[PDB]
A paper describes a structure:
Calcineurin is an essential virulence factor that is conserved across human fungal pathogens, including Cryptococcus neoformans, Aspergillus fumigatus, and Candida albicans. Calcineurin is a serine-threonine specific protein phosphatase that is a heterodimer consisting of a catalytic subunit, CnA, and a regulatory subunit, CnB, and is activated in the presence of calcium and calmodulin. FK506 acts on fungal cells by binding to FK506 binding protein 12 (FKBP12) and forming a complex that binds to and inhibits calcineurin by sterically blocking substrate access to the active site. FKBP12 is a member of a larger family of proteins called immunophilins that bind to immunosuppressive molecules and mediate their activity.
The mini-calcineurin construct consists of the full-length CnB subunit fused C-terminally to the calcineurin B binding helix (BBH; A. fumigatus residues 335 to 370, Homo sapiens residues 337 to 372) of CnA, lacking the CnA catalytic domain present in previous structures. (C) Protein expression construct of full-length calcineurin subunits A and B and mini-calcineurin containing CnB and CnA BBH linked by 17 amino acids. The root mean square deviation (RMSD) value for the overlay of the A. fumigatus mini-calcineurin was 0.90 Å, consistent with previously reported values of structural similarity.
Numbering used by the authors:
A (entry chain A): -50 to -19, 31 to 193
B (entry chain B): 1 to 112
């Protein structure tokens, strides 16, 4: 029996609101180059104090165990993706430059392009600049669990890729991704709400 | 107020979801004009969530714990207990009241 998302929508429109909700949920828990970031010098200094409390061993870096020490992070289906994205150099831990850079993307002062880039990074597991079929399946599966059958997820992943893959290499580039989502509110999903 | 529940067929009348319980539900979602926008029944795949902890829209978190195990009901959910002014992209317009047919199939390991 064929399966399609409501109104035959693509998997990015479908999943990005939940991606933004889950990541901003974790950022709220955590919060409770630098000079080019979306934060003034004062806000950066407040983040320095938030960073220091999370680094329990005073390494100057936050590791996976220190992130998962928060209950709101360990129960979160996107915790592993957020941690990997924050680790910009891919070294296993996040220094302060990475901490600030990751949070800066979610500022209300940030632009559409860096929020599109963060969203893309959620799906691009191996960081090669392309969302592969398997990556898109894996990350969607992380969020849906057993609420769709694997074969249902395969149909909508395959259809979305067929629709977005303009040059027909079987993967989704950043440009193909941003064109797919140009008429949905990705910036809103990828913004931590301002008082 | 934000969610009203109309019982269509009763459950066992004794087992109700509590905050933090995981529920298993078959649902069909409709707009007020009656048009179906989604259905777990049509894809033959029940929906499971922890209830009462903000993992689903407020109308479900407040309506589902009122149901007893096995009940079929209709939840009418105002936009403040649903997707609000934004709506849900591709599916739900802004400022939409939502009508869910809901069957409570499981509470944790208890099954109807
Ligand atoms: C990787 C995929 C994403 C992941 C998708 C799944 C696990 C598959 C699961 C069957 C959802 C359906 O997928 C076919 C589809 O179900 C709807 O059609 C629907 O009938 C609905 O209203 N439901 C689903 C059943 C519980 C109540 C309500 C809901 O609470 O849904 C929740 C919801 C959308 C909350 C938003 C999230 C964003 C916030 O900003 C907003 O805040 C106000 C609240 C769902 C369960 C999220 O927790 C989880 C996800 O989104 C939505 C109209 C759109 C939704 O697709 C997304
Ligand atoms: Ca440390
Ligand atoms: Ca690093
Ligand atoms: Ca990739
Ligand atoms: Ca391509």
């Amino acid at each position: 029996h064929p399966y399609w998302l409501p109104n035959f929508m693509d998997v990015f429109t479908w999943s990005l609101p939940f991606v933004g909700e889950k990541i901003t949920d974790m950022l709220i828990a955590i919060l409770n180059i630098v000079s080019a970031s979306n934060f003034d010098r004062d806000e950066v200094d407040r983040l320095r104090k938030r960073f220091m409390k999370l680094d329990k061993d005073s390494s100057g870096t936050i590791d996976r165990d220190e992130f998962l020490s928060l209950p709101q992070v360990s129960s979160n289906p996107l915790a592993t993706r957020m941690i990997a994205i924050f680790d910009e150099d891919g070294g296993g831990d996040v220094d302060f430059q990475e901490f600030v850079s990751g949070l800066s993307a979610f500022s209300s002062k940030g632009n559409k392009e860096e929020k599109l880039r963060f969203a893309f990074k959620v799906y691009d597991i191996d960081r090669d600049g392309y969302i592969s079929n398997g990556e898109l399946f894996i990350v969607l599966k992380m969020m849906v669990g057993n609420n769709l059958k694997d074969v249902q997820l395969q149909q909508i992943v395959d259809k979305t890729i067929m629709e977005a893959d303009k040059d027909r290499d079987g993967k989704i580039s950043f440009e193909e991704f941003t064109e797919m989502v140009e008429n949905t509110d990705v910036s809103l999903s990828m913004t931590l709400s301002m008082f | 107020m934000g969610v009203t529940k109309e019982l269509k067929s009763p459950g066992n009348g004794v087992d109700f979801p509590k905050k933090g319980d995981f529920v298993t539900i078959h649902y069909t979602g409709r707009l007020t004009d009656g048009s179906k926008f989604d259905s777990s029944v049509d894809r033959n795949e029940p929906f499971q969530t922890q209830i009462g902890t903000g993992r689903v829209i407020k109308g479900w978190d407040e309506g589902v714990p009122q149901m007893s195990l096995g009940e079929k009901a209709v939840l009418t959910i105002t936009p403040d207990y649903g997707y609000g002014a934004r709506g849900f992209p591709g599916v739900i317009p802004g400022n939409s009241t939502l009508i869910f047919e809901v069957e409570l199939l499981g509470i944790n390991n208890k099954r109807a």
